[PDB]
Amino acid sequence: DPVYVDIDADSAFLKALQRAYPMFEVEPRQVTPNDHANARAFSHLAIKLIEQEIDPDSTILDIGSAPARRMMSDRKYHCVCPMRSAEDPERLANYARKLASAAGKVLDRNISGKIGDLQAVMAVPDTETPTFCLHTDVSCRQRADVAIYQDVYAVHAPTSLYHQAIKGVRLAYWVGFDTTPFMYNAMAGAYPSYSTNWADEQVLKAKNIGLCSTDLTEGRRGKLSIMRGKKLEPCDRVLFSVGSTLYPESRKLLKSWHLPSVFHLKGKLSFTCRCDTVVSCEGYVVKRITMSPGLYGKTTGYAVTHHADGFLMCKTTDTVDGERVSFSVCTYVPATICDQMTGILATEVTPEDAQKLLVGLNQRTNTMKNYMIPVVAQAFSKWAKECRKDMEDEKLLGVRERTWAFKKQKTHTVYKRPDTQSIQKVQAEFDSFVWSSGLSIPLRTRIKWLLSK
Amino acid sequence: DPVYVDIDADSAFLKALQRAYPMFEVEPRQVTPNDHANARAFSHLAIKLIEQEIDPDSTILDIGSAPARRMMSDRKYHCVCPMRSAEDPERLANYARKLASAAGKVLDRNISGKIGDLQAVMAVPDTETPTFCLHTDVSCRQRADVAIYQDVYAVHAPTSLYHQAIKGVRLAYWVGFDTTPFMYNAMAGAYPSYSTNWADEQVLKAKNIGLCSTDLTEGRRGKLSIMRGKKLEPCDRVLFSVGSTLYPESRKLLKSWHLPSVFHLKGKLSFTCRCDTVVSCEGYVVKRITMSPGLYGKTTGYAVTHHADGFLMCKTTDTVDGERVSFSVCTYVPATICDQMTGILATEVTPEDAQKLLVGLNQRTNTMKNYMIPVVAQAFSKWAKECRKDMEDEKLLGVRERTWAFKKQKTHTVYKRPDTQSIQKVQAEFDSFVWSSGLSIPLRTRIKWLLSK
Amino acid sequence: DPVYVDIDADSAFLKALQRAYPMFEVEPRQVTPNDHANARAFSHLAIKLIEQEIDPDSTILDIGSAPARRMMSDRKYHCVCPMRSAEDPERLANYARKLASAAGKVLDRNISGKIGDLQAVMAVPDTETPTFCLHTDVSCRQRADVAIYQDVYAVHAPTSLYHQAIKGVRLAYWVGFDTTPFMYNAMAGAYPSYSTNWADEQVLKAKNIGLCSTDLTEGRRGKLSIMRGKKLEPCDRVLFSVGSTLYPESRKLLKSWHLPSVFHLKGKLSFTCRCDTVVSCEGYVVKRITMSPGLYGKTTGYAVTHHADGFLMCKTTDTVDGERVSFSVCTYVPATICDQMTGILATEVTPEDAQKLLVGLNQRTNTMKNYMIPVVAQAFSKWAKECRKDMEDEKLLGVRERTWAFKKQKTHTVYKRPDTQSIQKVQAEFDSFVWSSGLSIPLRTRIKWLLSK
């Protein structure tokens, strides 16, 4: 009845975990010095909660599975494992090892059936079995009614969901990092509670952001290159660092999971679908999606995010490979600090004074990580200034002057305070939806040898 | 005898709930991290109180019902469910699932009768049964004497009430958000105790209101567009955000439920009707309506609101898509803070000093939400100024000078203090009152399969 | 079940050791005054943890072994010992002595088998035995599935790993000093928690770095030499001092162990490999490597380091053999000190004031070693200055001016704060991979005499 997580007993993250999962009873039990422990604990609790929601006798598709995680579960999983990633052969070997080690000692689980299914798949690679197969999300043929996506960032969401729906699935879950900073189109950012940093490929040679590296120079003035760059804009390629584990990602596929509250899937068959956010903790979320046959209602095309902690986006100046430039950066701020800055921001404050005030509030133990304090101090200072400029240039009610052109004002900070909401316009009507094994003989031989014993 | 609500045991909202429902005994029992928990708790208690008022042996029409909420009740409900919303098929499937799960375990409730009625409706979609039907409020033919509207914003109130009255209904209840801010014709606003924000569609690209989103710019002066806008006025389309759930609404239909204390319905038959407010809690209300055959008395056409907390409407300046404009905003303020500002407002005070005083009063735990403090500080500052201008320009008693024209003074704030009343002029004489299933074969097949087992 | 380490009972390093190995229970038991005790304790615990991971019945290759360390172990080691180092004959004699001393007193270990294997190898020097051989990593022919490298810096990593893989090894471990400072290309540096200093061969006659020596002079101005040096750049030869033990090293071979997260080995057979960091303590690390047959996925060529303590690289001025020059130096800083300097660095601070503040923070017992304090104080002072220069020269968003050349700014400090990550670009596709005993008759005779008794 208790749930055990692998974190230190004196961690501050434990209270946030307890507030996010009020239906459980959370115990710390540390066994390793993992440098991304908080992220793993959140994923573990999310799987527990999802299993508690649904009822047994239903079969669950596990898209992009890691089979060894599902091996001591009593529910009915069908693991979809294509070998498209360099980490997959080791996961498969680990599954076979775990299976062979406990073959008679454990009896409640369908251990023998799992061994037989794996052997049958190794013999002929194009066969479906109740617990395993080697197809993709589009080419699997097992029928079910629940689908799960755990830390899956590599598929286009509407195509995948349509292919699950034409097979009888009515309910789906998605677990992962919040997609909001990519809808605002930032160049780099942080998830500080999870020791995670990310950056665009064009700024990996910066100096003072979370994920970067550069070197010492004396500063020659020449650097004469005829190739005129002249624009610094975000591109599709992004790099993620979770603790010390590296993952590359694509901006398009990340944006495709920022789904509106109502949408329609219109193909040979038609469906009406909804998406809600049911767990949200300092930048990690769980989403629940339902799908129904036929067309009902109408769509607006709006997606909403609720901010429990503060969210910040701002302009910063740095050197990239020695050349001075400006670009945008985003982060999260705890609610108590935001509440304690309300009085200060009524006036104009310099960045240095803001930094001293924030250090005073923080270190009274650390509420927030120190390496983000200088950028936050700068953002708060610009926001406070811009507000004053609005108060000194009043307009007339009900009137929009355009004498025959109007000017845009400059904006250097966006600041979403606790208990406010973001709203963005996205696509809501989808009509367009458009095989070889990939295994190799030596790996098959290794698995067969490791199993047949 | 206790009533259990899904909120945290240390919440401040519990005392307000206890004061609003003095006839019950309210216990906190938290099971989920719902981000709009307070609104759900208020609706739950409202249904309990309404059921305690009326007597059994009467049949209750449930307009726009969600049937699974009425399934474990001992009273006699007739649920009117047309499938006009994208959320409806999932509600129907959930009802059928709940019914099938507990088919012999629960015996007191008319479980078997409900199953039979649902099956009979699925067979032929144009039949009335004692517990269910697929018609609208105008085309249902079941006769009753009580009607209930729970969070229903999609109908025109006098037409709907007339169609209920010609069928023998004598008493009706309405539960929902207070309609007063839409009678004052504001452009955006907040219900802060319920984590709720709303906005006109024309200002969704603002920067510093509750529900909005914008981006960074350097401020080009060109933006040369020949299309002269030249007026910024409210329009019919509005967006509501309750926690993170989104709802679109129409201004006309919202205004139609702000009913006067006495009115007449004059058709083929005639009725005389009254409307009173019986519960009011920080912007959420319950209204009771009675109807009688024949015409009696006379009407004035006035509607009254009593303010227990302070109500504010004021002019603010912002940037929308980068262009600087002014428009009106409304909110609610707790009574103790209003009482503690009485001495300060005797003189002229700057907005910055007002903001510092409000922060001092608030954080001594938080009485009011911090993200509204800057706008409130501005409003109080303008009100205090305008009062002084009245005191320095006295007129003569009993005289209205119009030398041959008179000027209007500028007004930037309206402030209704605790224990005052608003009064507005509305229509009170109504004479004008003016079908296919909408279900689909695959959904019917799914429901039949899910039921027949 | 306790693990015993040879350190003083009042040492501060014990808490760091306990945090790095949370699965053990660490007891101090001092028996010698070793001046590099901390390094030996870390290596001991690393071997314990690795043995706990893997399962028995597997045979372990020990590359560049010291056999006497493996003599009282119950696992199955095959020690690869070529006599290429001046320390090797004494290690071999010590092994034979240890074996002969306990020949009947100890029975659980394969003592008799080990004696027989050593004698058989002495008779014919080109024979493999289950526990011993005299080949190199490339010319050994024993088959196994685990390989271990303990403090091995003399081989080129991809060639060695390929030769282990074509023999059936699937898992490998590497224990040693962190390779990050050599990827930044520094000229000298320190690992202060382990009493270790290192330097390039060209600066051994400096005055104020960790490892150096010089003499007194009155300063003649002549020193007329026609040989124009004119550049001071790092070269391949480096010297390491661990306590008072000296080791020479090569920069190329050290860099070759800074491996990316995914890579491919493409020869006659092909493999896909991964490298993760599983233990990290103040500059000492353990790396785990897996290899699989066949080609899967794709590579990026990036390597990542996670910083738990602060890392610093900076420019310094010294005299070398009496001539004044400048070059770069690197070190590590504890996290609490870094956190306590956050407020000070918002302004410009002189080096002297920084030094006084650091002395105040440190001596309140010593958190960090005093001989590094002057260089750290200088680095912090320059970093704080450079940040200000960025804040006073803002650019426009999204724009990279190159009017037709751009200038590089000067950078004198790189500072990686706690909870940030370094990222470097390295090679990830490897295709190119290209014997006499070396023992002598008198040594063989000595070993035979010492054994035959």
Ligand SMILES: Nc1ncnc2c1ncn2[C@@H]1O[C@H](CSCC[C@H](N)C(=O)O)[C@@H](O)[C@H]1O
């Ligand atoms: N089109 C596709 N259909 C199904 N799986 C896919 C896919 N494309 C990539 N994948 C798989 O998705 C996985 C993402 S990483 C695996 C995450 C895993 N669910 C976990 O819990 O750790 C990869 O193994 C990759 O092989």
Ligand SMILES: Nc1ncnc2c1ncn2[C@@H]1O[C@H](CSCC[C@H](N)C(=O)O)[C@@H](O)[C@H]1O
């Ligand atoms: N003209 C009409 N007559 C009856 N119901 C209507 C209607 N127009 C819309 N509705 C229904 O009113 C519902 C409003 S949302 C449902 C609210 C529900 N009573 C609850 O407690 O949660 C929708 O399901 C919609 O189908």
Ligand SMILES: Nc1ncnc2c1ncn2[C@@H]1O[C@H](CSCC[C@H](N)C(=O)O)[C@@H](O)[C@H]1O
């Ligand atoms: N090509 C090679 N293959 C295997 N061992 C080698 C080698 N080149 C050098 N060595 C050996 O590697 C050793 C490094 S010093 C020995 C370290 C030892 N593992 C310990 O725990 O203390 C030397 O003894 C040297 O003989």
Ligand SMILES: [Zn+2]
């Ligand atoms: Zn399948």
Ligand SMILES: [Zn+2]
């Ligand atoms: Zn009906």
Ligand SMILES: [Zn+2]
């Ligand atoms: Zn050998």
